[PDB]
Design a protein around this ligand. Sequence first.
Ligand SMILES: [Mn+2]
Ligand SMILES: [Mn+2]
Ligand SMILES: [Zn+2]
Ligand SMILES: [Zn+2]
Ligand SMILES: [Zn+2]
Ligand SMILES: [Zn+2]
Lengths: 162, 162
Amino acid sequence: ALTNAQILAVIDSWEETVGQFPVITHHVPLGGGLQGTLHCYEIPLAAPYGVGFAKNGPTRWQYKRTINQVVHRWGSHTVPFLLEPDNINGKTCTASHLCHNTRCHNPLHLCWESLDDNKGRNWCPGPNGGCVHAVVCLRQGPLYGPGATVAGPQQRGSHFVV
Amino acid sequence: ALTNAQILAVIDSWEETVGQFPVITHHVPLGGGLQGTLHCYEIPLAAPYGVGFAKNGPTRWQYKRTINQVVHRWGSHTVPFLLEPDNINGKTCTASHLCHNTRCHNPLHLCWESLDDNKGRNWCPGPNGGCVHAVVCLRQGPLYGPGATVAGPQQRGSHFVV
DNA sequence: TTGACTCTCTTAA
DNA sequence: GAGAGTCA
DNA sequence: TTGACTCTCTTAA
DNA sequence: GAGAGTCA
Ligand SMILES: [Mn+2]
Ligand SMILES: [Mn+2]
Ligand SMILES: [Zn+2]
Ligand SMILES: [Zn+2]
Ligand SMILES: [Zn+2]
Ligand SMILES: [Zn+2]
């Protein structure tokens, strides 16, 4: 089993490599009509991606290191959290982008939480619009808003009450 | 079926059968520290479910009718919206429970919207807690809250900024 | 040991 | 959140 | 014609 | 949002 020192070494080599990714400045809604700035460290669109990185899906990557002749591989956004509990309330922990930008590997833009918590950030009003996430959102969720519902609740007869 | 008359007949028959489903009262959070009452028309747990209904999944049902000697079948919650566009902005329209209760077939608890709009209601603060859905929520979403994030954004070195 | 591909899987609407 | 097939 | 089962699929995290 | 195989 990899030691804590060895894991810290993986985390450090990961940070070293990701820190050299292109840094892209994005202006983002914070909620409450305010705008803020996020700096994403974006993995390249095509190979080569950086030492240890490889693409396993359109918006999926993995980080790989070989330690004492054994190959180890992790989801590319999971590496910052290798020393954290990997489940909570019986739910698997997932890497969760506070910037909602999959290519970003900035660990200051990631948290470690259930898939439900993760998904729900998409509709959050944002840190200046009423976010109640204990680990606060960095921005308003991209899907926040009135929605585009096509048809509302309705009945033709009188069989129902709300 | 194809004709408006035939579609109205399907909707009316569906409403008549669903109108005989047991009415179950559910007290629900509305947001803002307030609570309300919903009356769900709940499909039975086991066969027989009602004329035209059959279960295709633990929480999935279908409605079927024979028109012009041909069998026509729909997802059991889609029938109220058979006269509505089946897509919006190129995204498939889905039946969406405002009461977050799958067994419920009360059309006054259903809306017709994209899967994203549908999902996002799970985290809405609710009609008295700040819901901005244009077709308003009937209750606070069951997943609204601070979440249970295990680890927040963090770095070991000094390569990153927010 | 490393890169660049390949494949399938999870969850809850 | 969906569609469709197999039997009786 | 109607009922009661079976199977796999879609989406975007 | 994930894990794992192949080949050189
Ligand atoms: Mn996310
Ligand atoms: Mn729903
Ligand atoms: Zn980012
Ligand atoms: Zn938030
Ligand atoms: Zn209901
Ligand atoms: Zn709402």
